[PDB]
Write an enzyme that holds these catalytic residues in place. Sequence first.
Site, PDB file in Angstrom:
ATOM      1  N   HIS A 282       0.807  -1.210   0.000  1.00 18.91           N
ATOM      2  CA  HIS A 282       0.000   0.000   0.000  1.00 18.91           C
ATOM      3  C   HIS A 282       0.855   1.283   0.000  1.00 18.91           C
ATOM      4  CE1 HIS A 282      -0.052  -0.218   4.553  1.00 18.91           C
ATOM      5  NE2 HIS A 282      -0.060   1.115   4.448  1.00 18.91           N
TER       6      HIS A 282
ATOM      7  N   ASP B   8       1.380  -7.673   2.525  1.00 20.03           N
ATOM      8  CA  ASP B   8       1.532  -6.258   2.270  1.00 20.03           C
ATOM      9  C   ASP B   8       2.979  -5.825   2.196  1.00 20.03           C
ATOM     10  OD1 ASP B   8       0.894  -3.548   1.942  1.00 20.03           O
ATOM     11  OD2 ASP B   8      -0.331  -3.377   3.728  1.00 20.03           O
TER      12      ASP B   8
ATOM     13  N   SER C 134       3.640   2.376   8.615  1.00 20.40           N
ATOM     14  CA  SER C 134       3.463   1.404   7.526  1.00 20.40           C
ATOM     15  C   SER C 134       4.804   1.183   6.792  1.00 20.40           C
ATOM     16  CB  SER C 134       2.488   1.941   6.483  1.00 20.40           C
ATOM     17  OG  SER C 134       1.143   1.862   6.920  1.00 20.40           O
TER      18      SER C 134
END
Lengths: 695, 697
Positions: free
Chosen positions: B64, B206, B632
């Site tokens: 992402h 991810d 992240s």
Amino acid sequence: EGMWLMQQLGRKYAQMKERGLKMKEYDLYNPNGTSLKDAVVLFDGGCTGEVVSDRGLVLTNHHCGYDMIQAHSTLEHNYLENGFWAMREADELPNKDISVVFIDKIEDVTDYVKKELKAIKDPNSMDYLSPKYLQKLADKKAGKNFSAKNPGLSVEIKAFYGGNLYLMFTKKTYTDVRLVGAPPSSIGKFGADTDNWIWPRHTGDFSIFRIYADKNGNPAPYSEDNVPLKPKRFFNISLGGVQENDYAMIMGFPGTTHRYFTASEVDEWKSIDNDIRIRMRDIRQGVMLREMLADPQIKIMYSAKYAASQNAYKRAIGANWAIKTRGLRQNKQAMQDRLIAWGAKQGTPRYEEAVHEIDATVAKRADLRRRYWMIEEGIIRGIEFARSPIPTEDETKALQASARKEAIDKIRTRYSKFANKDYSAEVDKKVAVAMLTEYLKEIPYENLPLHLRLVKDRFAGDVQAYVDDIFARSVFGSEAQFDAFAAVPSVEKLAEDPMVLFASSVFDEYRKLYNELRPYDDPILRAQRTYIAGLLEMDGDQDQFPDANLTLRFTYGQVKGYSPRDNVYYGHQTTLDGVMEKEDPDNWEFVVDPKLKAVYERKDFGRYADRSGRMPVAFCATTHTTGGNSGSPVMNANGELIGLNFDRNWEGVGGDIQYLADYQRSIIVDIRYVLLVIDKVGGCQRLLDEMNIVP
Amino acid sequence: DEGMWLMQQLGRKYAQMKERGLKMKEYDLYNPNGTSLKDAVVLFDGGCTGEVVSDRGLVLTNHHCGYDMIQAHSTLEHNYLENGFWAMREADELPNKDISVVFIDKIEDVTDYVKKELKAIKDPNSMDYLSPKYLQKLADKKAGKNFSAKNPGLSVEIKAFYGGNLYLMFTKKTYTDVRLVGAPPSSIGKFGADTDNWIWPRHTGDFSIFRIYADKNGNPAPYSEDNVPLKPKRFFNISLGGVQENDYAMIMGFPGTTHRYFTASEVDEWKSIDNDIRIRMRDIRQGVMLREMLADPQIKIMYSAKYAASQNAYKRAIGANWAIKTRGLRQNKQAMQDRLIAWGAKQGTPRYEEAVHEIDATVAKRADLRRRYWMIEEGIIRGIEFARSPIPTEDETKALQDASARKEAIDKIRTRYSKFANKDYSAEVDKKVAVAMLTEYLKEIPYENLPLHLRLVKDRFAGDVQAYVDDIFARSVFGSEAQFDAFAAVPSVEKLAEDPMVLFASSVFDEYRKLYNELRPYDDPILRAQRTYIAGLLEMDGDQDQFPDANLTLRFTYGQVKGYSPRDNVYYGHQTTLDGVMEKEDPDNWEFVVDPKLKAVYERKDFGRYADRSGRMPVAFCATTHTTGGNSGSPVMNANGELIGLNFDRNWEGVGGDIQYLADYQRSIIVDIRYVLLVIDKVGGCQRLLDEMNIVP
Ligand SMILES: Cc1occc1C(=O)Nc1ccncc1
Ligand SMILES: Cc1occc1C(=O)Nc1ccncc1
Ligand SMILES: Cc1occc1C(=O)Nc1ccncc1
Ligand SMILES: Cc1occc1C(=O)Nc1ccncc1
Ligand SMILES: [Cl-]
Ligand SMILES: [Cl-]
Ligand SMILES: [Cl-]
């Protein structure tokens, strides 16, 4: 893994002791004496119950006593919403049409039935499974006037293992069974339909009744002169609670299982029965939900209908999950290939021929079975105007004497029951348009009910126009249209009525399909008698239990949770804290009783809380149960009552075909939670005093 | 609570980290005067973290985080977003426009310097102490004359910490040639899609792989075909030893924002204004949108992204309100401030109690205005699409009022109309959403506080919201394409001045800006009182167990690999497996489609060295580390400093962790490095990436 006959206690007893059973075999089930079995009852034909006092007090589920609670509830005394607690025996409420059945004696009559069957002649006779034929054999064995010589007693013979074993039951039935106590529906039905088939569970699903009898403790219908029954056996209540891995056992009346399905019957159950029910109910439910969310009045009128459709929809989803992921079809295939290989070795081909007969019959009836489920789910239960009034022969041969007014009054009464306070013609037209669009896509023209052919022939494929026309032109389309008919009635108007013609055509097709499919059951049933006899001869009657058939069975296992999916664990026990976590005042399903919320806040758990100070609510066990087991007593290694079975998790609904050790659980209300509610919510101390509560 | 610690704080935390399982030497993790593991951590593209995993500048971050670069290089012929991308040689790696990786070369405490400079006070209430412009002037003064020209690729920056009680200067090295190297298909990279957003258990792989390119001397350089891979100071070794329950884990990264020093009154405001209004308004917007998407498959395609965008912060607000309601956030802030007030009274200094009083009084004073602002922002600015319909600019109105400037203004207005009424806009869906949103807004906001045009609902339309909205579309120049074209053929400033949609958009934006301007002054007294408040907390309990609020600077956090009980009788473990991906597979749900190569790897158990001791294939794990947005892609380290995973999300039960860390619920959601290496190997077949990494047994 099984639902064992009482006769099979002798054969399972050693394994039960190794798993933790402490009681003597004959204290649990004694075939010619008194035992714990004598405290178990079939409650009102479809539930289990248990005697818990020397004065005939009976515990069962709240959902089992629901109709009796509802029938005694009024606007002034709403027992369904606030609960009911009789503070004296004279205040206990009599119930009409209620019964409790005790299994007084059980006898193996296999040789007797098989000898009687030898006198048949037709080898394909179904008398071996006929309730009428078996009742004639039961009456012959018990004696001409058995019931007059033995008051309250009746006999009954049932087939087991597809006709390879027969048992005669001597039953004692009591019909004066009075309502004693019930928690409010907020406790008794806490999760309501949202938590149905769900574990973890936080529902105090119990209700309390009392068996009344004549002065000698013999069955008697309701009379103000009846006295409480003093039973020969009742359960002691344990307050020792449960821990993970504890031995648990149940006695009760499981209704049906299909443990001896062929692989082809599993495929049929999935691809016809379940897929059609899932697809059709998903369409019906989606339209219904859309309408209920947009109009609060529609939500009130359709909530019960929506919930009733969802219950078996969820069961079919759970069952299909087991077929897809737990290898049900493959395990049935392996079971039948093993029998076929063994039969070839013995030089006996009848088992392979029997499996072949079942497969060929399943294959032959597929299109018919598909058409039946499509019409039953799609129209018979899917569309409300399918159950609109159809003028009887006695009404048409009266409309065309002044019995014309009598015919119209009976048709009006049925119209008023169809278009009742919960019926919406607009909601029904929307549901019908979606249901019929799916039905017409699946069922070809030559297989359609006669009236539905008009969608293609008269309405150019426009389903909406066809449904619109039914309501616009029908005498049952609105009240004003019915009244215009009732003022000038003619059999000619009824004969061409579009709603009458729809209802008649779909019911005609439904009955025709049922009649054409019914003969296919018999060759399957006869071949199953051979199939199961081979399985029993090969691997023995000890691992393979007889299919459930609403007879008394025992099952044993452990108090144990399970992992529903990757990295998730559901433990063996829920607490009152979980009820509080679920509280939602603006959701009628999750409202928490104020007295219960206060008990939780003050920690007023008395002798009912566990050693940590947490209040237990429910537990789950590896026992093998099914519909019919609701209200069953859950016992300790000592035979003491530790809870009541009230549900099973959706992951284990495929357990009716194949028990799922890693997923299937019985959902049980902890008896400590039952006493806490009687005590702190009901304040009915007299019920606690009459029970024998052991430390 | 279990903080986001400054690198300067590693020394004073080190002993506790060793007692919790840390095995590495302190200066191998961070050394202010020489190479450490800190040098292998990067700020990836301004809002994510990344890590260097090879001696040739290979970088790992989330899928992402690299999503825009994967999407920008994807075409109908080569859809890398859908099928993944695996450069089989360095020359095949794809350059990216507008990308950067930032290394934190040096970190210096400049508190005494900044506080001495601040003493030249012309106004005691000056906000220069928090001004990026003022602090950049101090950073440039300290660094030297044209530092960026004398040290190409390096830049200097000063940030305030602890509400202005500590200042750090960061020397940053920025690389702008960062190339796409590898990415799993979206089916792995975003496996749960928005359904599993903020959810644990999680089964999403991810990750994405990039490479830092530099000039011949390893110095930053913009994209050039002559650029060579960067040879870094430090890079992470990859561990294959995996994780077990209770293992020590630590993260370095760039957490963006926290509010650890909120008063109890700021917690009450966040709940009763910010969160309740966002929840109530988005629940209305989402309900209408969902009903329209379920009824029309074309509406579902047009509104899926808008619906998902509304849901993400709606879920966060639900999770945050759950913590306020059940985890005692307000009570713990109250206890923190009462303890400081009691201590201050004992010290003879009332300034801390006066500071808490100033924050409470300011919060109380701005309540009606803040309530009106959130009501209009959630209800109309974000809630109704025609609020962002075209408003003719001053120069467009002047152009339309003799010359070819008229057709230029009309072309400009047409362009904005075409962007408003695009392929995903439905006027029918928008009218239905507006009727519901405005009905709630009019119920909450009194007539005298309404945007001018909304007064017409009562005055002209007799309270009929539907009629008011119908009239806006029927009579507006932007109500349909034919209505716009009729206007464009005969345009007049007069038609635009009385246009109902222009008047609505203008009125609601006018009110929105007026509320913002009236509320903005209230931030300063709170900020100045927070400098006093946090100084007192630090003087009282020390800079040892209270971390500075996150501010997009490099921090470390430590904890254990551990699951949690979300509710009664339910436990979520510390580790998910490939089995859980297979359980979730749904071919008729784009969110849960499983890559065929991955499904085959699972069927053959072709897990090799990447599998756990029981032969199960690990996917993700969760840890008690304290992370937030900005973390992240952060490297997750072992007790030895080896890479064991990448942080990619946090569970909804822990979103209140920005105000108060929740030991029993809050978890960082991490993709297991064994799963990353399995995907590179068995799905991408990119063996060269495995060979360049230093994989330790
Ligand atoms: C995937 C899942 O997560 C939590 C619940 C479920 C689920 O499938 N529930 C269910 C299925 C069938 N009948 C009733 C309920
Ligand atoms: C988190 C988890 O995922 C799969 C299983 C478990 C787990 O905790 N198992 C367990 C816990 C307690 N008693 C028995 C077994
Ligand atoms: C009660 C519950 O059980 C399973 C999930 C939830 C839930 O509320 N989820 C959620 C809340 C807020 N943001 C995101 C997700
Ligand atoms: C807390 C809890 O509630 C319901 C089940 C459980 C449980 O299994 N706990 C647990 C499992 C494995 N490791 C640590 C704790
Ligand atoms: Cl009895
Ligand atoms: Cl002071
Ligand atoms: Cl916590």
